[PDB]
């Protein structure tokens, strides 16, 4: 069954913590507001939710989210548009992953229309908290774990459900768009075809962290994750990978790989490509993508414009690429970057109410 | 630096809890002693360890260990013998596997001979609740965990690491070994060359529980983890799997798939080896092992042997393998299992201390 958002038991803070002011620089996922989402689930059924003040998890030493990794979350934003109201993005998408993410773990499903209306009630409560300054936005974070305090490996009896927020600044400092070098290695593999990399489980995250060392070590800021014995690409660190080109049949084109089990179906991602669909001015294309293809194309100077997409950073140039010891330079800020500034300004119209449209819920 | 068990702290608990009644039924992972391990890092290095009652975990919902999987287990026994002396089984390997686990998660370094020394202390607090009764044992559970109040996927500057025990009773109730049954679908990836499967990492297992109930739903018990086109057989269920055949050359030998990046280097396994090899009656080797030569094994009748290993079960038995619809008799069970119950009986003599061996470690 499902919890109900008309079940929603409200309880309001004691002691409200201190917003940070602009001129403040908004560091992601460090500073939390005031409330968080809270439903507990067993066999008899999911609990009542409750929006009550932000406080620690209280969980027993044996909770299979911490032996066994039984944990999942999302990632979201809401923004404040210039007519003061907030709204999120797309978040219809989000609720759709997270169930499919339930589902692969064996926790316990939802109704993902109460889980929004939830989050919106959680955000109206703490809407003071959503930034007005440019670029700025609130972060969503809903978690699932699983909480059997049992070492037996199995379907836990007991979940947690919490969502909580946190004011961001992004951070491309003054709007900036600056560009990223990306370390290219195949001794490194984030996911395999028949593995778990296609959903967003905690498991997938913290291997990436030793790559990340390795990548900064040789003078990278992030990793390109290649895969098979082609070396296709398929993310940049933990974005979405788009490269915009004149492909080898002498046609312009924005082209990302397709979603087999080994890329994660971001949000950003799909609504890139759907957004570049509607203006029908190139040919857009899932395929996939191969270092021999890029190297080549490099050489001939057919491409424009490399890119990562995620709700984070929103769209992230790349310049370089270190691949088997020798250096790439891509010429993607030497080429405005054109494709990344236009999906810029779009996004930001959409996202900050300039333009009305269907994507956006209204909290 | 490290923590000093000449640095520890004790606190005894007020409330014990009770001991084995209203039932002698001593489920896996299900019960547990009355006090903890507990060692905090952060910036200024490790703190003192204490040894404190068993409490829950005051956790900040933006705990990396929950969001991004930054944790790892270890698992080890510890058994009290005839003259009431508990010993724990080969620790230093644990200790070694653990600190490996550590330094691929970017979690901080400790000493291995302190964090022991802590174990065994904590054993000397809780020694009473050491069964003594046949088969049975008490399950010692490390984890270390990141514990970054922060959303960013990076190195943690917070840590915690904890042990925790429990009773746990015999694998095979009543002393006769009771074989299991294993569904083999290609389909399903636990690891990967240049994946994180060689250690013992929570986001490993999780994955791994939807395809057990797959297992379950198709009468099997348990899963044989395949890898590659050629269907090589990695692992049985969470434990390392050995075949004993006379192979395609007319030679009597045990084998078991190598260290080749997808296989945990389990303790139990190494043990195997090593006894074995000390006996010298037959050939002993590490060499893959694929699906196709044990069909040819099977039809043949070259096959007499077929288990898993690993701390919770010892040494299991398989009779049944259900692959690509067909189902395959095992003819472990007729066959003794003469390799299993010496296997058995030899490491029961050491464990319990009938037999002095160096590798016991006296609490
Ligand atoms: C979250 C994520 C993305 C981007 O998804 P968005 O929905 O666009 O935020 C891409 N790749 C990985 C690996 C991710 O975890
Ligand atoms: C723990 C484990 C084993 C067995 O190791 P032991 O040290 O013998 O307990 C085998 N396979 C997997 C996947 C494991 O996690
Ligand atoms: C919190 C991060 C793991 C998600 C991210 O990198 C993104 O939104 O692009």
Redesign the interface.
């Known amino acids: 069954s499902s919890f109900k958002a008309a079940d929603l038991q409200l309880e309001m803070t004691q002691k409200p913590h201190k917003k940070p002011g602009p001129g403040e620089p908004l ?4 500073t ?1 507001t005031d409330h ?1 989402l809270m439903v507990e689930w067993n066999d008899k059924g999911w609990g009542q939710p409750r929006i009550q003040p ?1 406080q ?7 909770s299979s ?7 999942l ?1 999302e990632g979201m934003k809401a923004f404040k548009g210039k007519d003061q109201q907030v709204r999120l993005f797309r978040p219809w998408l989000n609720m759709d992953r997270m169930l499919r993410s339930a589902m ?3 926790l316990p499903s939802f109704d993902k229309l109460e889980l929004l209306e939830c989050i919106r009630r959680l955000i109206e409560v703490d809407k003071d908290w959503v930034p007005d300054a440019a670029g700025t936005s609130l ?1 969503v ?1 809903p ?1 699932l ?2 909480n059997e305090p ?6 836990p009896r007991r979940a947690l459900l ?1 969502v ?1 927020l ?1 004011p961001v600044g992004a951070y491309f400092p003054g709007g900036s768009v600056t560009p990223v070098s990306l370390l290219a290695d ?4 984030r996911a ?5 990399g296609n959903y967003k ?10 790559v ?2 390795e990548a900064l070590k040789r003078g990278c800021e992030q990793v390109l994750w290649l895969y098979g014995p082609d070396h296709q690409l398929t993310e940049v660190g ?1 974005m979405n990978i788009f490269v915009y080109w004149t492909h080898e049949d002498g046609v312009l084109e924005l082209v990302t790989p397709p979603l087999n089990g080994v890329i994660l179906p971001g949000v950003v991602r799909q609504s890139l490509l759907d957004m570049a669909q509607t203006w029908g001015e190139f040919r857009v294309v899932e395929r996939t993508i191969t270092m021999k293809q890029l190297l080549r194309a490099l050489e001939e100077g057919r491409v424009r414009e490399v890119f990562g997409s995620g709700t984070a950073a929103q769209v992230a140039p790349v310049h370089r690429i270190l691949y088997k010891d020798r250096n790439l330079h891509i010429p993607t800020m030497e080429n405005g970057p054109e494709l990344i500034l236009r999906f810029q300004k779009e996004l930001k119209e959409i996202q900050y109410g300039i333009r009305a449209h269907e994507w956006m819920f209204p909290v």
């Not at 560091?27 to 460090?30: E, I, L, M, P, R």
């Not at 989210?65 to 944990?71: A, F, I, V």
């Not at 195949?186 to 593999?189: K, N, Q, R, S, V």
């Open positions: 560091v992601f996922g460090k939390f968080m932000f620690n998890l209280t969980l027993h030493p044996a989210s911490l032996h066994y990794s039984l944990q979350f692969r773990l064996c972060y974070r978690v774990i699983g049992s070492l037996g490996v199995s379907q919490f909580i946190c195949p001794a490194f593999i395999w075809v028949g593995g778990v489980l905690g498991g997938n995250y913290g291997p990436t962290v030793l990340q060392q933990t």
